[PDB]
Amino acid sequence: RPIEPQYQRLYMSRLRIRDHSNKLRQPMRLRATNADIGSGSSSIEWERASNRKYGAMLAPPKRQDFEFRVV
């Protein structure tokens, strides 16, 4: 059942407060989505960073090497 509109407004305000001058900017989502996760990597400075692009953290871990030691 939907939460009370007052509390929903309070939470949406807490999401809005990030950028207040820009009225065109839609409020932040409760849970991050693909576009929000990928925008940072899409930016140019991150566009060059190949290790953080296309959901690198979201994807499951890479297979470790045949021989692996930590000492």
Partner: protein, 51 residues
């Protein structure tokens, strides 16, 4: 990443197979036309290591 940036890989780097979740859901799913359906259905690979 390799598919989106083939320029950076002059040679076909060994492609790791997906995880167990991927194998169960998509890669080896006849309904989804998983690209590993044929490999999963094969039997010689279970028959002998050589195959």
């Amino acid at each position: 990443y390799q598919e989106l940036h083939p320029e950076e890989y002059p040679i076909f780097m060994d492609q790791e197979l997906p995880e167990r979740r991927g194998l169960e859901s998509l890669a080896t799913n006849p309904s989804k036309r998983g690209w590993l359906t044929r490999w999963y259905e094969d039997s010689s690979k279970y028959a002998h290591p050589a195959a």
